[PDB]
Design an enzyme around this catalytic site. Structure first.
Site, mmCIF file in Angstrom:
data_model
loop_
_atom_site.group_PDB
_atom_site.id
_atom_site.type_symbol
_atom_site.label_atom_id
_atom_site.label_comp_id
_atom_site.label_asym_id
_atom_site.label_seq_id
_atom_site.Cartn_x
_atom_site.Cartn_y
_atom_site.Cartn_z
ATOM 1 N N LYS A 287 -48.508 -95.529 6.073
ATOM 2 C CA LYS A 287 -49.892 -95.057 6.006
ATOM 3 C C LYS A 287 -50.493 -94.982 7.406
ATOM 4 O O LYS A 287 -51.227 -94.056 7.760
ATOM 5 C CB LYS A 287 -50.706 -95.996 5.126
ATOM 6 C CG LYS A 287 -52.129 -95.514 4.930
ATOM 7 C CD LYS A 287 -52.925 -96.488 4.071
ATOM 8 C CE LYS A 287 -54.002 -95.821 3.231
ATOM 9 N NZ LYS A 287 -55.198 -96.665 3.081
ATOM 10 N N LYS B 162 -63.408 -89.215 4.598
ATOM 11 C CA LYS B 162 -63.326 -90.423 5.392
ATOM 12 C C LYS B 162 -64.270 -90.160 6.563
ATOM 13 O O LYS B 162 -64.179 -89.109 7.195
ATOM 14 C CB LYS B 162 -61.865 -90.601 5.809
ATOM 15 C CG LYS B 162 -61.605 -91.826 6.674
ATOM 16 C CD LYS B 162 -60.125 -92.055 7.029
ATOM 17 C CE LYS B 162 -59.933 -93.171 8.069
ATOM 18 N NZ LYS B 162 -58.526 -93.553 8.297
ATOM 19 N N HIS C 146 -52.859 -92.068 11.562
ATOM 20 C CA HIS C 146 -53.208 -92.171 12.958
ATOM 21 C C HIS C 146 -52.260 -91.590 14.016
ATOM 22 O O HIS C 146 -52.655 -91.557 15.181
ATOM 23 C CB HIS C 146 -53.385 -93.655 13.329
ATOM 24 C CG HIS C 146 -54.475 -94.328 12.525
ATOM 25 N ND1 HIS C 146 -55.805 -93.965 12.662
ATOM 26 C CD2 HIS C 146 -54.405 -95.315 11.583
ATOM 27 C CE1 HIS C 146 -56.510 -94.744 11.813
ATOM 28 N NE2 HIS C 146 -55.689 -95.567 11.148
ATOM 29 N N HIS D 214 -52.879 -101.192 10.933
ATOM 30 C CA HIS D 214 -54.277 -100.829 10.954
ATOM 31 C C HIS D 214 -54.768 -100.509 12.372
ATOM 32 O O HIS D 214 -54.459 -101.205 13.330
ATOM 33 C CB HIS D 214 -55.107 -102.021 10.337
ATOM 34 C CG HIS D 214 -56.580 -102.117 10.651
ATOM 35 N ND1 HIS D 214 -57.555 -101.425 9.912
ATOM 36 C CD2 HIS D 214 -57.237 -102.845 11.615
ATOM 37 C CE1 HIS D 214 -58.753 -101.738 10.436
ATOM 38 N NE2 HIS D 214 -58.589 -102.574 11.476
#
Length: 124
Positions: free
Chosen positions: A7, A41, A12, A119
């Site tokens: 993810k 988003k 990213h 993240h």
């Protein structure tokens, strides 16, 4: 299900370009990476570096995450990034973004084995 690591790459990473090339970059990338499928988003950051250089951040400078967690790491060097922010005219499903290019140090949170970024925390 898609892994946290996978993810992070989908939302990213953009090793295919060195920088955003036009005002439409965010509009196109947010859509293509399926980040506006369910809702717009609000903000998103893309990294224009090799995946290996970004994964290596997990072995760089340890720092506290914005929320206080201590599994964050800051890159020793700056990186080419693109900041995407929703514009006043954004309206689901036609999400719209303003594209901003910058060169900064990135801060990611890492987890697992192998220990990888899962993240994107901040850019400084």
């Amino acid at each position: 299900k898609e892994t946290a690591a996978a993810k992070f790459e989908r939302q990213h990473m953009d090793s295919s370009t060195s920088a955003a090339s036009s005002s439409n970059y965010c509009n196109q990338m947010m859509k293509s990476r399926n980040l506006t499928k369910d809702r717009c988003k609000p903000v998103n950051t893309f990294v224009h570096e090799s995946l290996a250089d970004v994964q290596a951040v997990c072995s760089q400078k340890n720092v506290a995450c914005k929320n206080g967690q201590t599994n964050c790491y800051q890159s020793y060097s700056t990186m080419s990034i693109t900041d995407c922010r929703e514009t006043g005219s954004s309206k689901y499903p036609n999400c719209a973004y303003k594209t901003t290019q910058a060169n900064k140090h990135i801060i990611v949170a890492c987890e697992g084995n192998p220990y990888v970024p899962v993240h994107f925390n901040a850019s400084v």
